[PDB]
Amino acid sequence: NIIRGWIFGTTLDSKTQSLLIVNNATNVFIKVCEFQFCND
């Protein structure tokens, strides 16, 4: 494993809703929201 999930959407910022499909060791975490910024 070296890849977990993806970030979709436009502006990738807290102005337009985005999508996050991060997967982990147990479940998946698909959600639609307006995440700000991470740099990590």
């Epitope: 436009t10 502006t11 910022d13 102005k15």
Partner: antibody
Framework: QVQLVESGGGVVQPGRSLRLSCAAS????????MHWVRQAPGKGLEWVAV????????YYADSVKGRFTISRDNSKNTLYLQMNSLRAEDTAVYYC???????????????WGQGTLVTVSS | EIVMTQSPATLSVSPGERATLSCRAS??????LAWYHQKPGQAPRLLIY???TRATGIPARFSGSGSGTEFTLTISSLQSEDFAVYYC??????????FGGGTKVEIK
């Protein structure tokens, strides 16, 4: 590093045709759209045309609609612009600029070439 | 067609202090606008996109604000590479594509 190099400009007579090229390297050229932007001396920037990442979708400015043709060759990482029926006001410097998808399909010109000169006179 | 207008066409200010520029749109364009920096003889460079977000490699002194039809571009401290011409370009109405007349910032 990215590098957009233009060629094909020069001196032309009114009513004639010219072809310009803009070679691209240093980035995945096949997945990005490219534009042509011209700037008349003493004037601001003027949009001209745009071609999508494959070539089915193209748009033109109302001032050069019908006379200008834009095309690309993915197998060579080259961009062309075929100009026909050149008039006096088409004297300017043309720029080829890569497009970076934002909000819409393409709205930001993030990298620009040095530009070439096109002048028409008798 | 939506027409950009730049009120401060002429701007002379000595290095060190702040400079303020404005661009006006005939119709509401939300925050969909970009600023470009162009010295004489060179290709324009991207400075601000989204009317409030700086581009990569842009020093923090460059900033902007405004939404709708009124926008401003603010440079807190001008340096030796900042005296040039700035253009405002809208991209809300995608098909037309329009640019401002541009402002020339020079040394006082």
């Amino acid at each position: 590093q990215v590098q957009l190099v233009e060629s094909g400009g020069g001196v032309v007579q009114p009513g004639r045709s010219l072809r310009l090229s803009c070679a691209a390297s240093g980035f995945p050229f096949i997945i990005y759209g490219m534009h042509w932007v011209r700037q008349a001396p003493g004037k601001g920037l003027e949009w001209v045309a745009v071609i999508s990442f494959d070539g089915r979708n193209t748009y033109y400015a109302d001032s050069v609609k019908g006379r200008f043709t834009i095309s690309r060759d993915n197998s060579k990482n080259t961009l062309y612009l075929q100009m026909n029926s050149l008039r006096a006001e088409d004297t300017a410097v043309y720029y080829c600029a890569k497009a970076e998808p934002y909000i819409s399909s393409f709205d930001l010109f993030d990298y620009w070439g040095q530009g070439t000169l096109v002048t028409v006179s008798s | 067609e939506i027409v950009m207008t730049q009120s401060p066409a002429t701007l002379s200010v000595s290095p060190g202090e702040r400079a303020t520029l404005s661009c006006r749109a005939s119709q509401s364009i939300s925050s969909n606008l970009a600023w470009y920096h162009q010295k004489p003889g060179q290709a324009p460079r991207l400075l601000i996109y989204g009317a409030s977000t700086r581009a990569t490699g842009i020093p923090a002194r460059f900033s902007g604000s405004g939404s709708g039809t009124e926008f401003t571009l603010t440079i807190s401290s001008l340096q030796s590479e900042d005296f040039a011409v700035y253009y405002c370009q809208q991209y809300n109405n995608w098909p037309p594509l329009t640019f401002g007349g541009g402002t020339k910032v020079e040394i006082k």
